[PDB]
Chain length 395, copies 5
């Protein structure tokens, strides 16, 4: 009577109570813990080592059947807070743990009448996910979390949800914005696990769908690459100025290399595969340097005064292409004759060499048409990728 209600209740409950045993009056009936998880934020995502870092708010509740008392004797007190180190605590944790999680400690738990026990805690989960960068700008990731007791079997601990699944699937009330990645949904699913028959352990599967935000990467990658893509408009109806034109084209190639290496060194870290953007980048440059090689080989072969190939080989190339397509006065007089030939040999040879440059000219415009076809294919596959992303958001 003189003692306060809280101290009397704590003395009546915590006394002569052994921790470390399952609080069930009959050993056959298993205890059922129920859990609930709320998304807070995605701290960091990296694809060099397949590591996902997230932050969850976790709450669990179960029945501690030893902790019962009559509220009518204890001055109407239907609430109690006790240290978490003095009662039973189940070992429910995630199946994979690349680290400890460096979780803070909350050393208080709730105790209602009729044995209800609740526990709240924040958790920082660092795990491993099967990340893929098949579609880099428009990426969706399906990660998994597995809540399971590491030692107890299905005859001891079973897992259940606090709320209906439909409410869990839509949870954005706590997720903070201004982040690189955003939550789409969380899906719970009850599975049964077993590796070796004798024992069957319970399981709780949480599927998380995460979608990237293609704004900063899109702006920093697609816009400036397309803008510096100027060989398309330069190579249209190319003149025979290749000699100095490809000198500047090789300068431009050096600039492109710089642009390719800074981007490669900073953004991609996929160690198992390649995005489609990278391989199409690669093949576009492949046939650009090939166009360079053809347009330098032509001018180098016609450069000299040997008129390219005077042997019957150009006609063969043409026909195969078509098939696959389907005294003193005497001295002064002799003086006159020697002058003319020298005065007109130079410009004649120069103009004959220059006139062979239509043979020079051919076939580069054709592979330019092939380049335009490749550009159109790249644009249409980007459009289809955006369409795939739009379907990906259909949830």
């Amino acid at each position: 009577t003189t003692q306060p209600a809280l101290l009397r209740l704590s003395d009546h409950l915590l006394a002569n109570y052994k921790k470390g045993v399952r609080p069930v009056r009959d050993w056959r009936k298993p205890t059922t813990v129920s859990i609930d998880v709320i998304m807070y934020a995605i701290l960091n995502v990296d694809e060099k080592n397949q590591v996902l870092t997230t932050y969850i708010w976790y709450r669990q509740y179960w029945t501690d059947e030893f902790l019962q008392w009559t509220p009518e004797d204890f001055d109407n007190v239907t609430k109690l807070s006790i240290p978490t180190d003095s009662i039973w605590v189940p070992d429910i944790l995630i199946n994979e743990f690349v680290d400890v999680g460096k979780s803070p400690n909350i050393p208080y738990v709730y105790v209602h009448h009729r044995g209800e026990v609740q526990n709240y805690k924040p958790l920082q989960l660092v795990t491993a996910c099967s990340l893929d960068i098949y579609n880099f700008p428009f990426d969706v990731q399906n990660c998994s979390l597995t809540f399971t007791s590491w030692l107890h079997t299905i005859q001891d601990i079973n897992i259940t949800l606090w709320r209906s699944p439909e409410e869990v699937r839509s949870d954005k009330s706590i997720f903070i914005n201004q982040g690189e990645w955003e939550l789409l949904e969380v899906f719970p699913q009850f599975k049964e696990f077993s590796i070796d028959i004798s024992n069957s352990y319970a399981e709780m599967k949480f599927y998380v769908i995460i979608r990237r935000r293609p704004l900063f990467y899109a702006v920093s990658l697609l816009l400036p690459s397309i803008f510096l893509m100027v060989v398309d408009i330069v190579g249209f109806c190319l003149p025979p100025d290749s000699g100095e034109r490809v000198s500047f084209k090789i300068t431009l190639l050096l600039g492109y290399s710089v642009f390719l290496i800074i981007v490669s060194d900073t953004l991609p870290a996929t160690a198992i595969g390649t995005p489609l953007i990278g391989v199409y980048f690669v093949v576009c440059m492949a046939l650009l340097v090939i166009s360079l090689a053809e347009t330098i080989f032509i001018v180098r072969l016609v450069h000299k005064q040997d008129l390219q190939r005077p042997v019957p080989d150009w006609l063969r190339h043409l026909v195969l292409d078509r098939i696959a397509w389907i005294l003193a006065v005497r001295g002064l007089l002799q003086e006159l004759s020697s002058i003319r030939h020298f005065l007109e040999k130079r410009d004649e040879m120069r103009e004959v060499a220059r006139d062979w440059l239509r043979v020079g000219y051919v076939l580069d415009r054709l592979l330019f048409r092939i380049y335009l076809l490749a550009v159109l294919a790249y644009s249409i596959t980007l459009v289809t990728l955006w369409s795939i992303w739009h379907y990906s958001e259909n949830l």
Copy 2:
């Protein structure tokens, strides 16, 4: 009597006292903890992962109503220090915790008569903030801290301030100088939190305003970029020396690229957006390389002796631009005739080609005027940014 006062008081108080329960004689009345926070320093700010690291000095006080004694019996002692592990300690912490905070431990607390209990501690807070780099040189950040009990509700623990808010808003007595970022104000605000009706948890909001120092970044970015901006004075009344001038302009472009890549690789780490300085940088270079492309296309098209376009297309371009603007002796005689034409063909063709370079010249000065307009817009938007920063300091 023979025993000293301190040991007698400690024996009288710490004995038969159960920790882990709320020290209230009636369970209905909630206990009220009050807090106080002082800024020390901003350790590190990075925008790659939205992480803020700060250092605070924290003090809290409340009423431990079990710890009461009469000073007239205990030889006039109105002060007491006891270990912090032997009494009740509330679980007031910040809502977000990207890490533990790696806080040191101070295992002593104050105990006055009439149940007053005070606690001092230093805290190293590492949190997540909605950082934005919309205005890079002149940046202001509004971060938030949320002191809240992780388990107890509003019927158990309520939060209050030790001092008046106006004193808290101006606190620079401890903040150390010589740092990259500086404190502006700290604002407390009492909110009520609830996610699900049944329970309502208290809350304590601390809004921190942090302003950057634009000295080293300004000196290292705006001054040398403006100084190496010399194409403005080079491109004024450009002569027809473009052939070798744009060879050196492409060299200058390579140098600019180097300057752009070292800066890009080191300073910016925004993964969600772009500052205005970056995009204006981008568009200025965009139309600089466009000026390069036009001034090389012109000289390459007039380079050869085909007099550019002898077809009626230049007149069309001009009119569309205007609309949008709104025996022996006989042999010696025949010898004379052949000489002259050859002796005067070369210089004539050269001078006719050179004379077509006014048509060559046009329209680059016009896009140079467009460049000057862009430069003026950049300067005026920098001025307006500085004005926005001056308003931002108005607090």
Copy 3:
């Protein structure tokens, strides 16, 4: 009777039981712990410091001979869970530990009748392995783990397997896919260790075979290097255009250098040796720059009008190569004579210099044949490497 079975059994067992001693009723008989390890994933592999990070699921079982009771008295309960801090736990650990392993804690253990005690735990092993990068694209690694008691001898603790070794050798039921490295087999072997006679300590050897996946590295290294390998097709029947050809070849060398340095700076981290790919890369470039040096030396030596070496040295080089192979009218008349020689000296000297370029031409095609032989050797050694890898998978 009134008390539940679990509490009565825990009180009967845990009471008056001293931990920290070996639970054997006769001290002569040693206790035998048995272990079992399952692969989960390979977290990270790096060759800069010879560090291997893995994840294992570990279970051990032994006989705690003090913990015995009759199930017929205790209401048929053949299962028990007790805290792991209240009984004896052997100190079985790995011999090498570059770090602690940052393992989570599972504070519950199983206790059956007749003294059976089982323990489950996850372990994150970070160790040191004798990694070799002799064969980089097609690599196989043989790491070792050594389970051993750090203090107890063979007269106290002996190690045994739970299951037959043949089942342990094939374990892929838990290993997660989508990783850089994949498991091949785990092999257990019982060894006896001793450094100094007096004492003999037991040991448990686990040999792990890990095979790399050559997809992303192969695509990013062999395909683009082979594609940019174009000097092979350029250098075939090289013309005497070397003057500007090697100017572009040196440009290409600069590009190759860039390609070599980004790759070197990012992928290889071997600090003790070299892969065969690197050294063959090195020697191929060696003789490419040597071809460059020869083809510039030739054109520089024949460049001037000194006709290369008019001294009898070229014949010596040829023979050593073959051996190792096994008044007024008079004034006008005098005017005529002076003109001709000047009008025909220039082109004559030019054509004589040009005609000496067959001597110029020789021997570069021969070292080109040597280059082709080196390329063939590189291809055939790559084929043999793939064949070695195919044998390596034979397990």
Copy 4:
């Protein structure tokens, strides 16, 4: 008697003794702890985040007035070692703590008669200092440490020195050599701290003076920069070979850029200011590129055959500079006349253009004299910096 002296003394002292209270028989008299710190090494200094890492050996002593006994009864034992967890330990620590310090634990303390208690410990201090890089090669830093009790006031704990300050100021007996930074002095000073009147807390200020070693940085920076500074000797009496000279000067500029960027990327990390060496580096390059711009503008303006500016503007520039300084036979005859002018127009125009290059030449030598003046100023300010450093060592 039969029991040994040590066990009897430990039983007599440690028994019935309450820890967690101040060991003073009268509560009014404060206890006085005294400290002593010895420098060991400076582990790491970085200016990106203002972090100082040091290593100290710390010893403290005070009077535990409860721990007294008569040595004449306890078999002459004037020395005792007891665990540090069983008695009172003051909470004296440093005011700033960017981390915990990761200090090892020494769980033994000394206990003499008459209550003397001593404690030895090593500490690894990581703190924040107001680092400045105003004078980079010749730098001196003044860091501060503040030993203070985090909770107790001046009426409870006071701080004193073990030894005289003069001995503390000279302490190099433990400092290890072969380090980047070296100790100069440690200065103790007793301050009184208070933020809010009611309470006054004690304080112990340790000022540390640290001086850098300018050997490796000096060798790697000043010697090679001065050596590659060759434009000074090249630009002396510059000839009119600017056309190809500034082509190589721009090549040299590229090399200088490389030298500037590797150094910038590796050594400086000041985020708040600039050293004088950097700004003088910047201004020297500023007017070097300005000399480049002037010497290219001149040759480009005189390049063409328009004789630079034939308009009366060069005279204006000169005067402003001075002010600021303070049938058949007829056909053959007509044939002769046409030849001469063509045969002598070319070389005449060439020589007239070449002769205008004295006007070309002027004023670059004058700005070269300005460059020499800047070089002399740089040398003299380096000399004055060395003199400042020599005064800085005066201690």
Copy 5:
């Protein structure tokens, strides 16, 4: 009798035994702990912060004189294992500790009769060593470890070796191969330490000799640098083709710069000094760029038609070098005279300019001989370095 021997012995020994005091029956006699250390591996060595990371196996033994019993009463049991937290443990540790060492815990210790107590533990030591990179490829390091009690004096704890020193000096039975660094010897030495007279603390010095493996660094540094060293064979009997030769030499310089910067950025991290290889690298490049400067200055000074220096200065340079060495028909006739001079002025001036290039040629071959002398000095100092390394292995 009914109770087992182990439990009876543990109850008889661990009961009524106070830990935290020195187990000596007379306080005057000091206790003597003996230690033994075995090398396992060298985890990481870096010279940016003078940090050494090693792994040791440590065992200590001493006499716990309270723990004695008669084996004839306790059923012949001469072996015992007890937890390490229940008895006295000396605080023997290393003097320097840049970190904690993150050592695992082995909570069991051996106890024989007659008070013998042994303890085994693995230790991961991270320390500070006076590393020097004076001789980079052929380096030997002499590190020190100091086992000492941090609180107890020579009157309480003395250090001794378990085995003879000669056996300790040769210990390679546990060291793992395939590492960057290898063990040479470990040398123990007994020192006496004192800083301040009153007290004298014991000490145990372990000198470790570590020798690098010069295979990967040698292959990656000396072979390719020597191979790309081709200016030696190019500069031999240099022709007057310098104009384009030094254009390619400056290209080669750019390539050398790239080679120098990647290597500098990756391998060296010495912050206090320089290796001899670096400074000889520096001086070789110094006089290579000086050769470049001389050979460009010569050709630029003779480039124009001013015949270099027609002033009497070349003779002065030569002599100082030698000293330091120790009507109509009239019109047609006038027409003839004007032709000849123009027809023969050009080639005459060209050949006179070309003929002045022997004066052009001199002195570069002489500084080439100086280069060859420098190369020979570099080779001979490398040979002497290898000889020093061979003596260094003499142990």
